[PDB]
Amino acid sequence: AEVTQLSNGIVVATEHNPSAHTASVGVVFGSGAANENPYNNGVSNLWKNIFLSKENSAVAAKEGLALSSNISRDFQSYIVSSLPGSTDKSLDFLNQSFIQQKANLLSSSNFEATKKSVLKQVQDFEDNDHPNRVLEHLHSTAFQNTPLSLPTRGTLESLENLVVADLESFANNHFLNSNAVVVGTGNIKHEDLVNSIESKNLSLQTGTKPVLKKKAAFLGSEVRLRDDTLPKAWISLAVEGEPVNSPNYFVAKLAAQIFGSYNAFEPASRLQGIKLLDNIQEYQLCDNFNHFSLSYKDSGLWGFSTATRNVTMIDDLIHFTLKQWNRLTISVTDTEVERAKSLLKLQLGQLYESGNPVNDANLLGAEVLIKGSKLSLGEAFKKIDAITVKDVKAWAGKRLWDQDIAIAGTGQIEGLLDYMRIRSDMSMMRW
Amino acid sequence: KSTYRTPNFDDVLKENNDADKGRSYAYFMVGAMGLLSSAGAKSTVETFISSMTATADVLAMA
Amino acid sequence: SSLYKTFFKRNAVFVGTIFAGAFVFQTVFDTAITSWYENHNKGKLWKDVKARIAA
Amino acid sequence: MAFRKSNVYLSLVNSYIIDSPQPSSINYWWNMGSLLGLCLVIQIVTGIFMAMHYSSNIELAFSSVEHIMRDVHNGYILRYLHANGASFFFMVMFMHMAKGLYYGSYRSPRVTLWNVGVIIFTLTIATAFLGYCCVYGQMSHWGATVITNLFSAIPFVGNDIVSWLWGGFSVSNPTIQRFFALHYLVPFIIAAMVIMHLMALHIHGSSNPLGITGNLDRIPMHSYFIFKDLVTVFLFMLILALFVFYSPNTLGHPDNYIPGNPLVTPASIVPEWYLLPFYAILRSIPDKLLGVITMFAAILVLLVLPFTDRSVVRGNTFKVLSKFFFFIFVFNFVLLGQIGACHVEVPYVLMGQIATFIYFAYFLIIVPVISTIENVLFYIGRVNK
Amino acid sequence: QSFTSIARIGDYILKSPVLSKLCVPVANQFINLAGYKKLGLKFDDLIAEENPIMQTALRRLPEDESYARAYRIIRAHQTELTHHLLPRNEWIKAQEDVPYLLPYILEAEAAAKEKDELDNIEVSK
Ligand code: HEC
Ligand code: HEC
């Protein structure tokens, strides 16, 4: 449970955990899809794909190393996993690919074979992964004409028109030092890694900063992707949430836990202590749903997602759910808040502490990049337990009560009523 | 075209410097409509009811 | 309009405040009208004629 | 499908009168409903034809009814039909209501059905009364006076509501004319209410004498019950005929053949027979305000029955204690009526007071107590441990 | 009134030899005067079913009992409409008049009551 981080030339961050069996090293950049443009959208996803290409991947495999990378909105990360002993051979492969081979990975035979893969990849996504496709579109309309609206995997149109020069252009503007953090998780010590790094000098484009832009903003709107040939209806709905490093980051995350997630087929799920289940189970209004409090640097999204085959009662699904959310402003109970506290701790635990160093790396790098440090799991619990009913009520009265929303859906959505109908349910009549 | 590229709404959108601008106007409008409607309903109801009170020709003081 | 946000603060006007305002309006408006009306017809009314009479 | 099923208008008729699934075992007590519709029609038809010859002015009302009696061809048939029809309307309504009481028709899931029925009963009382005032006989005038004064019991504004209702200093020409206008209006509100009654009946269907489900054995309304309804419709007409032609004034009051007089109230006032039980209840309370409140409560208490019936089975068919007490309630009601026709004298006043007590106690004490006891008896008579 | 409540009172009386000898004979006389047995019905057949508890109960009832309940109810309606009673040798005997649905009704009520309790549990820190 130690968050160690020191700066010499490069800001090095590590979180050691003795019993681990393995160790992971890599760099995480403070720039992701939210830094691209509508036309070069998909560059970051492309980088990730070449970094994992058959050529580069075969080199580290001989050495007994494994590769992993993830593209997000605010950040990007390249990671190399290894045994606790080869904690040095990872640092060689890292520098070899980001300085020496930052021109060998971009050959006219590799880039074309990779481009052909992300194209079949992103296409496959839009053709079949409906729930994620919808959540991606939710960000698209909620933050339109603003950074957060750009899909992480990029659009098929900005992708097929992307050239090697664009990769370089992006890389030379974001893969800088002042916008980077070298992460090390697994078992290796902070002082073990920091030495192998402060050994090899060379700055490589120092003093350079990435370009700036215009702040992200929420806009009440919707995008309806009707498709009557699909067998279900997938919809996502949300209000403007909380950004990371916000006084209410936790109240919000707790508020989502109150309604939580559900799966109509799993017996135990049907028994949960969520009032909403009394309303939706009578006529079986949906196969599943899940609330969330997504947070980013400039903004966030608080809402839920759901999938259903009861295409003639979608208005009741949406109506009941939004009536429950009304309660957070006027009648949420102590026991509901308490049930949430326990469950939030359990999930926040399983995330920050799993048996996989790669997840730890991403989380560590991402956090240190936005707030210059990581909040310890124990420090979180103290904040979570401190939340009162009054807090939830004040938060909801600001974020949920009579506030614009964003909607997105695909499939048999004829039954999803108009905007103003849904919008009206964000409140209740009173004397 | 890509569904992620949201069409232009610039002509319709209000340059948000005052977020609660349209809300204040709409709510005032609805409120004034409710005010005048209630006054009218009250006057109409009173008009019908008072038509059942004693007529001018029967209030003779014997 | 910040003039609205001072009295109602981003919420609509409630029935009670509507009904209350309606009762106030009904009286104020009626006086304003009866006044303007009688002034416009000054000299033609019985009030005015009664003064010019002495019995 | 058949045309009767597909046509927008015919399907309504088909679902309510032709294909409606009825419990195979319902008895003749279930025939009162149709008889009530028939009564409603007879009242509306004969009323409109007489309205053609009636004058509402206080100086002409009484004589215009005499004009209907002496000059209008078949006029006396119209008046005696309308008048005797009102009485028959109540005889049948009480049986309809009593049938519901006995079989637990008021129980869930037919509460809405029962509540709408209470509203109809109130509207019917109001309608008959207004009609009664249109004759403008001696009873008419005083009835119009008493019932409108009932509102003065309300504190503060009460006497105002009254002078308002009268449209003047006393029951006069503005009163009787508004009463006629109102007597014509209300029957159409009853009709609309009767439709809502039927809508509520259609969602769960009729109950049956066994008090259990009818879902395992139903037979079509058409043929079986259409023809069974015909049996009582004709019997109903035969009896009404006997009064209309052979004894037209037996259910009326001689004082109504005397024009209303503002200065003289008859030495002996006996209201309409169907109002007597309520008249007795009113008279039994030596306080003005409490007197009218208790009378109105005698009607509203019908609303309480779905909650005070603690039983686990519907109806009194298989219940010894409940059947017995059901009849105490019935004859207590008749007694109240008999007391209402007597003078406020010694043995009667106390009898009236006790009967009133018993009436309310049935709903609030006897039913809940008895039904609980019966529940337990049913249990301990079969469980062996 | 719930069956849990009916059982509480009924069992208390049934155990105490004071009331058990005083009441049961009256109850037995009551049941015979009711006459439902002459129609081929068992008391449990008479319970009003239009509520969730009874619907759950009838749903859990094993197949063979269900077909039998059905035959008894239909047979009852037919006799009633003919204004007769079944021939005495067809009447339900006291040994047969068993509370077969009762165990399902009580189980459902407890399940229901628990849920009501759990949905409203307060918490003391
Ligand atoms: C205009 C249509 C009209 C309708 C609809 C109507 N009536 Fe009448 N009613 C009259 C007229 C006209 C009189 C006066 C003539 C008379 O005394 O019969 C009257 C008189 C009465 C009387 C006095 C009877 C008597 O002793 O003379 C009663 C009671 C009555 N109506 C009951 C009813 C009931 C109950 C209904 C309906 C369910 C009804 N009326 C519907 C017109 C109507
Ligand atoms: C205070 C109660 C009450 C009043 C008054 C009432 N009803 Fe009903 N009615 C019922 C109930 C309860 C039922 C259900 C009977 C059952 O299935 O056990 C019913 C059923 C019916 C039925 C179905 C057949 C039957 O008789 O059971 C008809 C038709 C009907 N009512 C017509 C009417 C009409 C027409 C009126 C009067 C204008 C009326 N009712 C007034 C309570 C009432």
Ligand SMILES: COc1c(O)c(C)c(C/C=C(\C)CC/C=C(\C)CC/C=C(/C)CC/C=C(\C)CC/C=C(\C)CCC=C(C)C)c(O)c1OC
């Ligand atoms: C589930 O169980 C049921 C059941 O559902 C039903 C429906 C019935 C059958 C009974 C009924 C349907 C009764 C229904 C009664 C009505 C709908 C009455 C509606 C009433 C009215 C008064 C209609 C209004 C009439 C008019 C406006 C016109 C009259 C005036 C005229 C014609 C004036 C003409 C003028 C000139 C100058 C010629 C049962 O017996 C039954 O038992 C088991």
Ligand SMILES: CCCCCCCCCCCO[C@@H]1O[C@H](CO)[C@@H](O[C@H]2O[C@H](CO)[C@@H](O)[C@H](O)[C@H]2O)[C@H](O)[C@H]1O
């Ligand atoms: C026919 C006779 C006519 C009588 C008068 C007409 C009706 C007037 C009703 C007036 C006010 O009724 C009032 O409406 C506003 C909506 O505008 C309601 O407001 C509700 O919705 C608004 C809008 O999303 C929310 O901001 C608010 O927090 C919420 O309470 C308010 O709670 C209710 O009290």
Ligand SMILES: CCCCCCCC1=C(O)C(=O)c2scnc2C1=O
């Ligand atoms: C449910 C309403 C019951 C009506 C009760 C009022 C009964 C009633 C009186 O109390 C009365 O003093 C006179 S004088 C002439 N008619 C009446 C009459 O009907």
